[PDB]
Amino acid sequence: DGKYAQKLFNDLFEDYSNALRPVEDTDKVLNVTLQITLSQIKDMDERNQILTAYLWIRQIWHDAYLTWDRDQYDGLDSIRIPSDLVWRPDIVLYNKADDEEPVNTNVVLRYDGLITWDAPAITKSSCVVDVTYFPFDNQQCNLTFGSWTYNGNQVDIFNALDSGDLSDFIEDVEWEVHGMPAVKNVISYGCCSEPYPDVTFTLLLKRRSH
């Protein structure tokens, strides 16, 4: 019980740096599976071609230093932790049209080192009009996510699902969501550069019929 949750926490973080990429061997990669949930479309700005969206970003990865033997902690297999206590993969929206308050979040850390991190985000990003495809009143909005600092040999990002999660979407008045397919892009510069991955969600909006 709570008795042991304190013991485990103390034992886990007695020698733990949230600035060190949590791999045993430094040339091992750290894999991250990313999932985007579209909560709602806050504002689709046609004049400035900017989409403002509410999203939930779910990130999953393994921390090689945050493991424990369950039988040594009264069978405790999971604990909630403020996300800022653990190393975090540093993934941001690349196509931020926004020029610029941070929010406290909690991860769930499992006995085998698996960390799940749900965190909300309010993104602003450019869109391109499409008038060629039916119904010829379309907005294509790309959300591209990737690491701010790490290359793909250090942190590699993978899509959790074929597309964003639209099961909890709030219908917009003027815009219908036609899909949110996701893809992964890995970019290498010149002959020999190390890989640079990102995952891109393509929000396809068609103007609502009324």
Binding site: G146, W148, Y150, N151, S193, Y196
Partner: peptide, 13 residues
């Protein structure tokens, strides 16, 4: 290009 990529960038310098 590499030099307009924050993951690369400080490496063209």
């Amino acid at each position: 290009g590499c030099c307009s990529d924050p993951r690369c960038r400080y490496r063209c310098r």
